[PDB]
Every structure is written in structure tokens, then in C-alpha cells.
Design a protein around this ligand. Structure first.
Ligand code: S7X
Length: 212
């Protein structure tokens, strides 16, 4: 996260780090035993975390039973850029580890709405990797502006942006997951090149079918 700020410890209890003991991607706890992430983020899952490195009462590492990338995703695209990870056991839920409701209604976020993106991605254009979770509020772009599919959304990127290592993490509007950070390489922080997020509402059938 560029142009952001440190998150409050455990205030975003759905937030996962997909990890060789190293953070690779964000993810969102969406059920007791399932984390939603991005397709190219492919393995363990750290729940309950603020610091990656420091001991915390709520921190717990989970092995993954299986990884279910969207069947239509491809290594060279950011279409269908979703991944569902099943933990090897149901997560211990509490204040600090809690699923986030995700958008099932297929309607766009009002353009202009500030939504919240969190991650342990890089915090500058040198390689700088933060120990503690970062976040930033970002206005959602209208689809025409974003275009210049039905299944992607855009947010402004005027220095404040998602970037490398934020892939698979959340874009939250009004307490509901609306987007998942994309897992393709892109220039960050350039206003002319918006951040790109998978519109979770477009994938409602798919997510349900996996979790069914
Ligand atoms: N949405 C975007 O802005 C964006 N997404 N990616 C892909 C990406 O980060 N990927 C791919 C899957 C794994 C993940 C990855 O490389 N993790 C390893 C990693 C490395 C360094 C630092 C940290 Cl903190 C880190 F976690 C980017 C790549 C470069 C620029 C922008 C982006």
C-alpha cells in the first residue's frame, strides 16, 4: 500500500496473509475454513495478524487443505483473478479473526465512494516491505473511466494505491467486500493508471459453488 497509513491492530479481522514463511498476498476470510485471494497468489495462511514478525495473542498460522483458483483464470491475464483457499481446519473465530460479508448484489458501488484497501504490500517504489498491516481509502471510479468488463472495478491511484504484495487483499465499501486486489504486475501510484480490483459480485455463483 502506497500513500497509506498503518492499520489499527486487528481492526480488520477478516484480513489474511497468504504466505515459505514469507508474505505473498493478501486474502479475506469469507468463511470459517475459506479465504478468498487472487489467482496468481499460488502455501500457508496467517490469521489474526497485525505484525508479520511479532508475537500477538490472536496470531495463528494455518496450512491449506486445497487451493481452488477460478477455472477460467490464466497466468498472463487478470481476468477471473480469484482464488479460494481451504484451511486445513476451521479457524478459531473471535475478535481479531472474523469472516467479512461479501457483495452478493450485482450492482456497482456509487462512483466517488471511498473504499478501504488493506495489505502488507510494498509501501514505496523501492522494495520496502512493512512489518505491520497498512491501509488506504480510495475513491471508486465509474466503469467508463475504468474502461478507458462487467467484472473489474477501478479506484483512483493518485500516489495512494494498491501495489506489489497487496494482491488478493480486500477493497471494502460500507463494511462489505466489493473488490479483491488484482495479482498482475502494474505501475502503482500513477493517477492515469487506476488500481484494478476484481468485482466480487460478478463471481457470486462461483464463490457459492465452491463453498456449497
Ligand atoms: N495489483 C497490484 O498493484 C500488483 N499486483 N502485483 C502482483 C503481486 O504482488 N504478486 C503476484 C502474486 C504474488 C504477489 C507477489 O509478488 N508477492 C511477493 C512480494 C514481493 C515483494 C514484496 C512483497 Cl510485500 C510481496 F508480497 C504486482 C506486482 C508488481 C507491481 C504491482 C502489483
Amino acid at each position: 500500500i502506497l500513500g497509506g497509513r498503518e492499520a489499527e491492530a486487528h481492526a480488520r479481522p477478516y484480513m489474511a496473509s497468504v504466505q515459505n514463511g514469507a508474505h505473498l498476498c493478501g486474502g479475506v476470510l469469507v468463511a470459517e475454513q475459506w479465504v478468498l485471494s487472487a489467482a496468481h497468489c499460488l502455501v500457508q495462511v496467517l490469521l489474526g495478524a497485525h505484525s508479520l514478525s511479532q508475537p500477538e495473542p490472536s496470531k495463528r498460522l494455518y496450512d491449506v487443505l486445497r487451493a481452488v483458483p477460478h477455472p477460467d483464470s490464466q497466468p498472463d491475464t487478470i481476468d477471473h483473478d480469484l482464488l479460494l483457499l481451504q484451511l486445513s481446519e476451521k479457524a478459531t473465530l473471535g475478535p481479531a479473526v472474523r469472516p467479512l460479508p461479501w457483495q452478493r448484489v450485482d450492482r456497482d458501488v456509487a462512483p466517488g465512494t471511498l473504499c478501504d484497501v488493506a495489505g502488507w504490500g510494498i509501501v514505496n517504489h523501492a522494495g520496502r516491505r512493512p512489518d505491520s498491516l497498512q491501509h488506504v481509502l480510495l475513491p471508486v471510479l465509474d466503469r467508463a473511466t475504468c474502461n478507458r468488463t462487467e467484472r473489474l472495478m477501478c479506484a483512483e491511484s493518485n500516489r495512494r494505491d494498491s501495489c506489489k504484495g497487496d494482491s488478493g487483499g480486500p477493497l471494502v465499501c460500507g463494511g462489505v467486500l466489493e473488490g479483491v486486489v488484482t495479482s498482475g504486475s502494474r505501475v502503482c501510484g500513477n493517477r492515469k493508471k487506476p488500481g484494478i480490483y476484481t468485482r466480487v459480485a460478478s463471481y457470486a455463483a462461483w464463490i457459492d459453488s465452491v463453498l456449497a
